[PDB]
Amino acid sequence: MVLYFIGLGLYDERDITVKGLEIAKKCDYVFAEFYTSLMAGTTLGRIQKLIGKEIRVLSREDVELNFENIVLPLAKENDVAFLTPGDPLVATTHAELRIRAKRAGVESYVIHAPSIYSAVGITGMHIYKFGKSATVAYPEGNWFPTSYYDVIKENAERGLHTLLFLDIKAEKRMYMTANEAMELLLKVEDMKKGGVFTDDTLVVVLARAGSLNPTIRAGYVKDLIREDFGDPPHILIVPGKLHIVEAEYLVEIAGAPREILRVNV
Amino acid sequence: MVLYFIGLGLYDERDITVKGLEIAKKCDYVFAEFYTSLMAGTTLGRIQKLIGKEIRVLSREDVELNFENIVLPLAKENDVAFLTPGDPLVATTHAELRIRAKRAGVESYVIHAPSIYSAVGITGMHIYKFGKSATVAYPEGNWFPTSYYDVIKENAERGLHTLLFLDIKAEKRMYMTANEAMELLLKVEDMKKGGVFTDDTLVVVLARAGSLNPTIRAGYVKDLIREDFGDPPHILIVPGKLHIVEAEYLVEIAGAPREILRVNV
Ligand SMILES: Nc1ncnc2c1ncn2[C@@H]1O[C@H](CSCC[C@H](N)C(=O)O)[C@@H](O)[C@H]1O
């Protein structure tokens, strides 16, 4: 009778909320997609074992083109769950799927889970200070995306931090590293030359948030661009005006160069 | 020798993650604070019952002034948990607590949980479009704060949405309703005449995020200012120019007026 949007979490199958696990356990059919993000600490098998149901994994095309043909029909007679990495509506286009559910006479419910959007708090950067967010997309053929560069500029101008989601091509098993995002940004800097992202820019890297030992590093591009941050997923953050305690955290927890402790108010 | 920062979730006791619950159950001591926020859909008793551990509540002063003499000493020869509503480290001052842990020779680990920062995605507003966030505080004595008004202005000017936390007196359990927030903003608008918040401004109200039956309402200030959104806490959102898909979600899911499909897009 109902359809559930249930977040799975950041890292592994234990990042699902208790509410989500118990509701998922009682659903008749369980669907899921693993293309909007990467849960580096689990497998479909572990998820299925935790929920006690077999999970039918859908592709991007299944969802975007056939959600109402594959999932919605079963919801009219059964309770259906649709699992996704992180929080189901964050940094995805899944919100629109609720409009489809409604237009098909299906009631939907959303069970949240830890999202990378708030997990950025572990970097020590005050979350209220983040401005507009962006995605560093892979160039394809002659098309070279650059809008994310302007986002940084705009936020930096306002003294705000910038959260940069990194691209993912799940079908190819390609997960953009913070390294690759930095390479791409320098290339954009060379083109526009707005003094927005250079070798001297301070950046923060958060890798595998949700794991017990995520990689949290901060430093100048020239120094981190070739550093190994471990397995994906990675997210990149370009901080704006640092508060004293923000810089202190980065130095003490993220191993940032002691120098950044000296802010230029 | 270990301190765990564990998120409690959004609404009730089942909003904690499976990882957070299992880890907490294994801790020798469990602390919590409910000053940054409260879990309006549950009680300390039910949380305590779910964890199976006595939960020691800490006040704002216990944490901010005495964290190192109340919590850290025990973390030296035991596993200790520190529960907070939402996602750990989102509250501005919490990240600093990890620095105190390090200074005490104590290892700390973060276990995430849903935060309103990501949960607001249920409003249909694209997450990348949120700008700087702010808190609406009461005017008191000769003090009349208005910075949150300028935040809205700077965000909306760049087509960005503004997430607005409402004032709360946790200890006294006194919330600021979305209604009062609107009145304050209208009063601030009358003082600054910047044309930021008026009877014609479109707003979104989110209450009881995390529950299976949250209240999601969108409309113009003149129609919602005296509407009943239910029990606190309330979260106010002043969106920027809406995406056609964002406007459609508000209409189909949040009961927004058809008028926004042409006026705010
Ligand atoms: N655990 C994690 N650690 C680091 N980055 C992550 C992450 N999870 C997601 N990301 C970032 O976010 C991108 C996916 S966008 C989808 C985000 C998801 N809906 C959520 O709520 O978290 C990843 O490619 C990466 O750039």
Ligand SMILES: [Pt+2]
């Ligand atoms: Pt969309």
